[PDB]
Amino acid sequence: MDWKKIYEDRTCTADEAVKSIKSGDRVLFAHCVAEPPVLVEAMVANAAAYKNVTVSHMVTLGKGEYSKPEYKENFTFEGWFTSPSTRGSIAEGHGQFVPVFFHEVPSLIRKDIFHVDVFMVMVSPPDHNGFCCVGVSSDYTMQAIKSAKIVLAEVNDQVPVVYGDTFVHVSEIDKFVETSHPLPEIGLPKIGEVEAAIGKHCASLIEDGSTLQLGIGAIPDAVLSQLKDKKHLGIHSEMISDGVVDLYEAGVIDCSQKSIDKGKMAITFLMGTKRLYDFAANNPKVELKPVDYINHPSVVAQCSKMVCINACLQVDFMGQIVSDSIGTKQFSGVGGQVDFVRGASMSIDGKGKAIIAMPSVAKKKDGSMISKIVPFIDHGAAVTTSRNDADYVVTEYGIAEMKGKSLQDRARALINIAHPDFKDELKAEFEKRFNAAFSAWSHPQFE
Numbered sequence: 001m002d003w004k005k006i007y008e009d010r011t012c013t014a015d016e017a018v019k020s021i022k023s024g025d026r027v028l029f030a031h032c033v034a035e036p037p038v039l040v041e042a043m044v045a046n047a048a049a050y051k052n053v054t055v056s057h058m059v060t061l062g063k064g065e066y067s068k069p070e071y072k073e074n075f076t077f078e079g080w081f082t083s084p085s086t087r088g089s090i091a092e093g094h095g096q097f098v099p100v101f102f103h104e105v106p107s108l109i110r111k112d113i114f115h116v117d118v119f120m121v122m123v124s125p126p127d128h129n130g131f132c133c134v135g136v137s138s139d140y141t142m143q144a145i146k147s148a149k150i151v152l153a154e155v156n157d158q159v160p161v162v163y164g165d166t167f168v169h170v171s172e173i174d175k176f177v178e179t180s181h182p183l184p185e186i187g188l189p190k191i192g193e194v195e196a197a198i199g200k201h202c203a204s205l206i207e208d209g210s211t212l213q214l215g216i217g218a219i220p221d222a223v224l225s226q227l228k229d230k231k232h233l234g235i236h237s238e239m240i241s242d243g244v245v246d247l248y249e250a251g252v253i254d255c256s257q258k259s260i261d262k263g264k265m266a267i268t269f270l271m272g273t274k275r276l277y278d279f280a281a282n283n284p285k286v287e288l289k290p291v292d293y294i295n296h297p298s299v300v301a302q303c304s305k306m307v308c309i310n311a312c313l314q315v316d317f318m319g320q321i322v323s324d325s326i327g328t329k330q331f332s333g334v335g336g337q338v339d340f341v342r343g344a345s346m347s348i349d350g351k352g353k354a355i356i357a358m359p360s361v362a363k364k365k366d367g368s369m370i371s372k373i374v375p376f377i378d379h380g381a382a383v384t385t386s387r388n389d390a391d392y393v394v395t396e397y398g399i400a401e402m403k404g405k406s407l408q409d410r411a412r413a414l415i416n417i418a419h420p421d422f423k424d425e426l427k428a429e430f431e432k433r434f435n436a437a438f439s440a441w442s443h444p445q446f447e
């Protein structure tokens with residue numbers, strides 16, 4: 001009745017919409033696959049009208065065009081998480097990066113630390129009552145809507161209706177630009193030998209009726225392919241991808257055994273191919289919720305037999321875990337890695353487990369092999385998951401237990417799970433570091 005006039009009255013072009021942004025403004029984007037590409041390209045196109053507009057967001061599948069050097073006087077990129085197309089700028093010095101736990105984002109917005117002048121969002125078209133769906137995010141996207149002084153909507157009819165806190169009434173949105181284009185999509189990873197091995201070991205720590213979290217990154221997929229014998233698995237996770245769909249139609253994941261959000265896969269956001277968005281649409285077995293629910297340590301602590309599984313770049317001899325930087329170079333963020341390490345530990349049922357997984361080696365550019373197991377982290381790296389937070393660590397060669405184990409015994413476990421061709425250099429490094437023989441009991445048969 002009134003909502004359609006409101007809608008009809010606020011409909012414009014991407015060009016005029018981006019005129020709500022003024023110099024000095026903090027601008028924020030909807031998360032991930034809810035980033036409005038037309039509303040973004042419009043804003044970039046009109047660069048030459050802005051002076052130091054902060055452009056915040058997290059992981060992105062767009063061109064990060066605003067973070068390029070040329071734009072350094074119209075935009076300051078201020079990432080809360082980075083990705084290939086925006087961490088250029090943090091390295092070169094004109095882009096910014098803010099370390100935040102993912103679950104804390106909504107709060108900081110409420111607090112007005114992350115102040116928002118213009119949130120831009122992609123939502124689907126209104127239903128009969130005038131509620132657009134974000135469909136593909138919830139994360140901070142819901143709080144930013146309530147808190148943004150101005151909200152631009154890139155209404156795209158390709159966006160799904162997905163149950164949960166995904167809804168926004170047209171009355172909450174200052175401008176609408178109707179579009180039509182496919183949503184972005186990531187590639188499936190190559191599940192090789194190393195991938196497969198990391199898989200089965202994680203699969204030996206998941207018991208039937210486990211609830212799972214599976215973070216951004218390649219590795220939690222080879223895991224999923226190793227889970228086919230599992231029964232009654234449930235989901236409570238930041239995100240889920242195509243791998244989770246396979247397991248769900250293979251009858252393994254059914255959430256019949258959860259303590260909270262019974263019968264549902266509870267997620268904060270979706271990223272994947274179109275098979276995933278289509279599956280998630282109008283599906284009672286999926287519910288998107290805000291991150292300061294999904295990622296909240298207190299809430300994760302309530303999950304049943306929780307197995308978190310995330311990835312890292314390197315690990316040191318104390319079990320300090322580095323997941324978002326290579327030396328002084330910023331690469332991603334904590335995102336939710338720590339949120340689910342904290343929550344699995346606080347498990348009320350006492351059964352929580354967090355698994356950080358990684359190949360033991362990585363290739364460099366000169367083609368030299370390097371150990372991801374190190375005496376010491378790379379100069380200037382950020383400790384992501386601290387030694388006190390550490391739990392399970394997992395490579396192609398095995399599992400190592402960091403929880404309640406001494407500095408010496410952790411180093412022993414990790415060396416255990418390292419590429420054989422590095423064990424002996426790692427062993428020398430042990431003895432140097434700790435002023436103690438690598439091998440603990442000694443035999444009279446020698447010296």
Ligand SMILES: CC(C)(COP(=O)(O)OP(=O)(O)OC[C@H]1O[C@@H](n2cnc3c(N)ncnc32)[C@H](O)[C@@H]1OP(=O)(O)O)[C@@H](O)C(=O)NCCC(=O)NCCS
Binds near residue numbers: 216323326332
């Ligand atoms: C750990 C993380 C960065 C890995 O993601 P990924 O896409 O699986 O990353 P990769 O293993 O491809 O590593 C990236 C590259 O750096 C290199 N690399 C990895 N570890 C390295 C190390 N210790 N030293 C130097 N280089 C390294 C690899 O060679 C790799 O290949 P490329 O250079 O050919 O592209 C990612 O999962 C992440 O950002 N994690 C933290 C956030 C998190 O856990 N969030 C939960 C939210 S759902």
